[PDB]
Amino acid sequence: ALVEQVRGQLQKLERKYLELKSQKNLYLARLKSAIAAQKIEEIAGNLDNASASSLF
Amino acid sequence: APEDLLERLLGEMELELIELRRALAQTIATFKSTERQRDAQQLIAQRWYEKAQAALDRGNEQLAREALGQRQSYQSHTEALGKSLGEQRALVEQVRGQLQKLERKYLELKSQKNLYLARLKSAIAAQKIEEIAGNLDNASASSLFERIETKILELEAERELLNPPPSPLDKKFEQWEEQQAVEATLAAMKARRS
């Protein structure tokens, strides 16, 4: 009963690991997407859209 | 580290299983030595008995009496030694039983050690996976994985600020006016291709 019981934990734990691994990229990607968006629309307003005193 | 002690303590027992081992052997030697000495004493007595078996015949009774008188001295040694050898036998068999039992109990104790050390690592090897798993996305708020959404929202929260979304009126209207451009453009279509 012990050997079968312990293997089940390994079976479950191994499953939970790769599942956790998959989500990491999906959230890192969305981190870059938002970050990669910040510095384009920020300057865009600085040029001609944000308000008066804009460089344009 | 207590887990090392179980290896060390069993090492100490091993010294005894070779110390008690030596003591038992020493007991057997003297038992054999005592056994040998008894045979010699009776042999001398036997020689007088064999030698006494040559005088009583033919009418020489006097000589035979003297020879047997000498043998009584050797017989006394045999009787004392004879009883001792039988007594010592119980000791050698008795002590061996302890060695038989003790040796059995040792390997039995040895077997269980690994079975419990293994289950020690299994639980220990489990602690540091499920502990961090909760730290990431399962334990509670403030978990490193959840905190990522906070930064996502913080930047996304600024998105609606720097570029305010269109008002519901324009949303209601821009879609509203598309229903006519499509139909009005199609109005010239359905009438032209008719």
How near does any CA of chain B get to the CA of A31, in Å? 6
**Does residue B78 contact residue B42 with C-beta atoms inside 8 Å?**
yes
The CA distance from A56 to the nearest CA of chain B, in Å, is: 17
Question: A31: which chain B residues are within 8 Å (Cβ-Cβ)?
Answer: 148, 151-152
With tokens 């030596």, the residue in question is B22
The three-point CA angle B41-B44-B47 to 5° equals 150
- Measured between CA atoms, the residue of chain A closest to residue B160 is A41
C-alpha torsion B53→B56→B62→B68, nearest 10: 30
Report the distance separating Cα B71 and Cα B77, nearest Å.
10
Taking CA B142 as the corner, what is the angle to CA B141 and CA B146, rounded to the nearest 5 degrees? 75
Instruction: Tell which residue, B149, B145, B156, has the closest CA to residue A35.
Output: B156
Q: Which two tokens stand for residue B30?
A: 């003297």
Structure solved via: cryo-EM
Sign of CA dihedral B129, B131, B136, B139: positive
